[PDB]
Symmetry: D3
Subunit: 309 residues, 6 copies
Amino acid sequence: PNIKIFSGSSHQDLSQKIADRLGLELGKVVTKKFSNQETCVEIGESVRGEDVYIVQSGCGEINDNLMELLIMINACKIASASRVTAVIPCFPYARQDKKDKSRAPISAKLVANMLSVAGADHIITMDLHASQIQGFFDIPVDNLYAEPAVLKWIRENISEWRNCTIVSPDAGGAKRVTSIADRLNVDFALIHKEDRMVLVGDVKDRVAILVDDMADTCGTICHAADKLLSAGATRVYAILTHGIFSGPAISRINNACFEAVVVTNTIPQEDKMKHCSKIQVIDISMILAEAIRRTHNGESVSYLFSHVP
Amino acid sequence: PNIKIFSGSSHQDLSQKIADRLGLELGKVVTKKFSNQETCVEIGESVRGEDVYIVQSGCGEINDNLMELLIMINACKIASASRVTAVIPCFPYARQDKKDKSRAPISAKLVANMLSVAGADHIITMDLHASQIQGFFDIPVDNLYAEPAVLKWIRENISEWRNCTIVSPDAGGAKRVTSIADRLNVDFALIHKEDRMVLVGDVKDRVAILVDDMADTCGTICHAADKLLSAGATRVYAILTHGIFSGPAISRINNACFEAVVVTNTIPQEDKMKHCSKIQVIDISMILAEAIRRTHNGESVSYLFSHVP
Amino acid sequence: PNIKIFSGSSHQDLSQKIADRLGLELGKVVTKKFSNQETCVEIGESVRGEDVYIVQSGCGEINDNLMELLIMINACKIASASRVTAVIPCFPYARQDKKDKSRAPISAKLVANMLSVAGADHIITMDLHASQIQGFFDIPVDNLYAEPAVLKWIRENISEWRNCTIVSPDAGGAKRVTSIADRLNVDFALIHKEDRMVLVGDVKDRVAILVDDMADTCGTICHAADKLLSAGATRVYAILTHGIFSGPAISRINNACFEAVVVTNTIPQEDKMKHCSKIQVIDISMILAEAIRRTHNGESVSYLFSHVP
Amino acid sequence: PNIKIFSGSSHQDLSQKIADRLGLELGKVVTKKFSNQETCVEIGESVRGEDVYIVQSGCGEINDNLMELLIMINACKIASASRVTAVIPCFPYARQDKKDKSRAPISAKLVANMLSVAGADHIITMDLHASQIQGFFDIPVDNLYAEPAVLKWIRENISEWRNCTIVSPDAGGAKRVTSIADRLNVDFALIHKEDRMVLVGDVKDRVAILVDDMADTCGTICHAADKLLSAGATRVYAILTHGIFSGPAISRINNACFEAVVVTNTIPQEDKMKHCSKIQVIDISMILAEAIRRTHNGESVSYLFSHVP
Amino acid sequence: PNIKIFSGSSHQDLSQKIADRLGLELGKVVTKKFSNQETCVEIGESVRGEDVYIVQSGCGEINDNLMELLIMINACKIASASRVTAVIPCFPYARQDKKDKSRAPISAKLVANMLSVAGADHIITMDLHASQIQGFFDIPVDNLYAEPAVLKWIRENISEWRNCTIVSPDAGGAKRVTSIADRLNVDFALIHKEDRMVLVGDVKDRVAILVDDMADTCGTICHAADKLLSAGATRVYAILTHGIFSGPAISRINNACFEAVVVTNTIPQEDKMKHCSKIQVIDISMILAEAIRRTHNGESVSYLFSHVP
Amino acid sequence: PNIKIFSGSSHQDLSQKIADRLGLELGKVVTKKFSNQETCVEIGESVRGEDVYIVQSGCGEINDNLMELLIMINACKIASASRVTAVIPCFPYARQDKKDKSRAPISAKLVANMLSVAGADHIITMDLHASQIQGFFDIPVDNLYAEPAVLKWIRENISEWRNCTIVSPDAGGAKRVTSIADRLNVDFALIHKEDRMVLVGDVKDRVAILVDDMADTCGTICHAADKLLSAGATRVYAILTHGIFSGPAISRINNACFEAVVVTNTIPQEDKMKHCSKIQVIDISMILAEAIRRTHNGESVSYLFSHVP
């Protein structure tokens, strides 16, 4: 059983980078739309008794990409692939992980069920919005962390990183920032809204680094950055693993005080970089490639939680 | 347990017509998109211990509508609805019902599995592309027929209907046309391609009526109509239950010789009627409403296979 | 189909209170242990075509109680009960809701799967540790809130409640306290550890109210209370929905500065009240009884999220 | 994991031919009936961690053979076989693949469900009546084609094959005949009933070859052959992949004008050949053996769609 | 939801008796075989939202009857019956309930799985060979007992029943006979083979009554009766709930010393009574009818374990 | 894929013996309880693509051990183990294998379902109380037999074994004793209660050996031994595969006339041996180790039914 890497249409550059790091050519697949907008998928090579990895992120036209992924999984499964793994760098509907006093769907659970029923045997993803989403599956889920790469970026790009403060934009992400604050041996601050925001932790004359899983409309991080500049911070950075940047995010970032907005490339960023000078990208394709290769060879994946490969 | 009718965004006029025929107000639901294009659904009323019917056709932005339907089904199911029924007038991915010497998905089966796993207890649909799709489910599926309404339209709109010929555009649909030919006591002709088409059955000086389940790009029916005019037909009609009309269909129909292109309203047609004079619509909302009401009251649904209500 | 209420051995007083509020006698069931410690269950009355509710909390001998609940659910399901609902005021293994860089089980998901496979059709619980646990199920889960009752207790027991500060012991619970702070129109403070704790929000000369879902060993709330007294608070209260109080919790509370430790009665408290003077109990049996009665009658349960019955 | 081939009682000659082509001895199994006609199965060798293939066609006493197959699959699955494959040359109940305005079962779907629940991991079959039956499964299904062998037989047995006409007995099979007509570069004709039949396509002074999936009572092909002789055909052949030949088929064929009735050996034919001189058999055991060997070795099976091995 | 009773072809007299006791007409169903011996089923009336009971015993052509039952269950389930119950007086493959050091199927479990996957919601049966078969299902199973009727027959037909000895033919059935011996206040004897049999318990000058679940070939009961006459018994009776009587059973019984061979009518007996004078039948249709009526009305079924209705 | 052996807390000595016989070190796992008595499990080594065997018997604190086993299975399954096998020497709740005229659970079936849903692929157990429990699973179950070892013990410890009588304590176990009686060529006796017991078979001046699957309270075997001494037996032995010895068993055995009470070590016995001189243990770790090694290597397991390794 050999590795076969197939790309969905969502993020072809990432799939190519992963394929090069694996020393493979991207599997031959045709993924387009019929005239009536139904997703047309044709696997261009035999996947029999192979270990198939399908790379597709929850970005762009999310429902189209999700249906493409499900259809590709189904095609590979009924084509007698030995094992089918969904490599989903940004998990779609991850923020709909609970109901919370609303007659709402748990869309993340629905997506997990659909992936399972399509025939996925394994999920590889990066920085799930809530790690409880792992429990939405009955198949194994490897939730990788961009932190090795975020810490690397911070050390090699922020000269004052030893005196910086890692800041959570909200009470929800505090855990994450504390983890980072522990690995850098720096202070960590929290910010919560009461339209006013309250900040705990000295940030005067120090570089502040907001950290988060995802920036969609960037209202949260822009408000946090305004508050950080109010409290005497020298420069404010924002580091996010998922740069969705939908709606007015680009205009708000352009009007914000960020020195840089660093995001990983779980979502393609070339178009946003054109219209926003201060967006920067941290490659995490090495982490994804190493996770694929370790799942294939039966080596430890959790080794990657703390080690940059 | 009362009837609750909810509309997806795909076909709101049809949902309203069904609700009026049932004497009900469309259930309160908010169905929109978040900024990052994730489907947001909020059920605006309690559906506890109710018999819920969600109307959504496989039309327009098909993957968006399908995800909306799945999310709404899930929301109603975890909101403790007694029973959830998907009313899908045009079934999405119905034409992907087999592999046939290709490493292709069976997308119709995947859609059926997704509907089942979302929590659908029952499916109501009209003129499935292949009735074998009923076997793709383990829940009951009521496949209604537009034929009572097509026959009604033919009798009240084609003055020469007793001397007409019902024509299949291809060998696949012959069964359907024979059924119609049996109910009208008229001749039936077949047309098959060898770029040339061959026609069996006298059509000279007689009105010809092409009959089909769906017109997507209308290449099939336009070629058939050209052949029918070649063979001395007086006028050529086309009657389809699903008027998808994607791609170049409107231009081809405008350049074709059809007297009329009659389609049912399983798919909204107002925009296409603006740009195509010869499109006409047969209301099938009475059949759908009667099917809903009979499933709710435990009356016979198959009664509708031969009776216009 | 009538309501049948059955009690497990974990919390018989709560089951009796619920049964009285429903106007019913607790269903006849024998729930003991064989000599070799296997759980013996005998349903002492017919539950055919009935709506069965089994009350069992995740308290005391947790694995014994959980097995008792699963066995009782199975017995009622194969005895042809029309519907079986598990009323689990404190959900066992709720804190094991994720893996988080550890080769650990997701025990909450396993418990959810076991409840589903035993035959539960519905779950009623109170203040799930993480509401994402709702997504661990495919059956509906009603997660009730003790907040109506906590707010009631605060208003009728703390004379200075209009000038109090609601305090989260950690960053994780902030959401909860903010909700309470919104419903009372008071300030809210956070406390997070860096062995030192940092507090944001003025608490001097004001009554502070720590709020949390559960107190197991009470290290968290005792450290938070010490910090609150350090920061000039006048009195410190602690309000928790689940009073587990295992290990050294009673000694720590006795040595702590709390004016009172208020817990709901999702877990029996009589033994702990004997050895701890400052423990007080808020009855939530009215909320549970109303939820049972509303699920049975098909009325809105979410009405209870904001209304004390 | 080694190949183990087991024979049901339906077609032991085919199983032996397959076993010889694989270089194996048929697995030791006892498959008989108890006195009260219950199917008795005993696997006479260990199948642990083996790749098991059970050969059983839908022929003869169909329900007995189907139950034998299900029981053998179950026995191998609970005996810890690594993988169990059902090799079903003629799929039972394949013609019951839809309801079609009747309160009828979809028996093909029921058979698929029973095969899945018995523990089949994979299905190998030949010329499914409708390829949509593939979607009735969630396990992979390899639907082989007898066409490589039919084309071979036509070329080596019909001297005038370059000037022949391939004829469909009905509108349903036209696809199949067109495929054959494409591979031979000959004309293709259709025949449909209006008790009268209508034929499209010149057949005068040319050899006609009716092609079909199955001959049960042979009314269809006998009527088609009568019509072909009416239209001036020189000789009429019939080629079917499944020679069921039940009821009056042998008498009708004996009284018909066929030069030959060629069928594959998916169903044993020795008894029918005794009473019908013009029946001939095309061996497809090489295709089945190659499919088994390619599924075992992870080679491409679809290679066989166009290549005679 | 009303009761609909449908008969399979196995035991139509029993179905009619049950229907008369329920005050109903047997549901209209056509259950025959196509020419190629595939089971043809057509439900002749609407079963929507009805409580459907299908009566079919594991007798005669067992695999044909079992497939008929599965097909009828499937037809009723996809016809939107509210509930489908299989009434199986004699459960097929019940004696294949374990492997026991053999590479054998557990055919009873396979049958249970097939019944569940066909869509059965409930099973009613009489005197399961092993009551552990109840655990082979996840749906409720009501295993009725013929004992009320056997005890009634013994009292009204054996004048010396107060001084009789109830005898088990083997060690396996001892439980059953002890139950009967307890309800009659008589002695109970066991018989086990060492070709020789050993008997424990005085039987001289006393009437002996062998009791068993089923007589297939009657070797067991004939050997037991020979031994009982050897040990000085006055008359020997045999009472069995299931009179299969396959193979040489009728000849052996005719050559045996039994005063009578009483069997219930879970299996039709008219043909066997023609060739065997000493076979007598105990009607259990009242027990089955009462069980159906009590499951429908939600009354206690276990009431029937000790009460003749 | 390598063998990984993990021990639950129930029987660590047995797990160590098995690991030594396999030439392996017990897998690193932490299995303890949190303060609130929730089971804490941490797999201390990678189990990716490994063949995992978890050893845990149904002994001691049965519900705690069962939950530990389920949690460990779940942890290994979501840690991407290639295969997970539960090695359960004494199966918990095995005696609750049927309902039998009681509104009781089938707890053995519930345990089987829980093991399957936790992710077990395979079960290895010894002397199931009823072999029908094998049918409670859909995964393969290997039910080993202690008989090779019991026969070995009898021959090497009872000098008069050629003239002994093997005695069943009840009618239920007769099969077992007959098997042993067949392998030793000795007489076999039965004992059944009518508070009085009746014995069939000469036992005077002969050594009697009671044989059974399990001794829980030892009332059965103590009453049987009293009866055997009444009937002139010289010495009475008891041999059981499962020595549970709960409740008053030790006192009753101490007051009984047994020469020895031999049990296997499926359950730890060191504590009971301290208080009971006549308990002796037969090691069956060789059978379990050989079964593990044969399932891993794909060799025949049933070879062990008759051969001591």
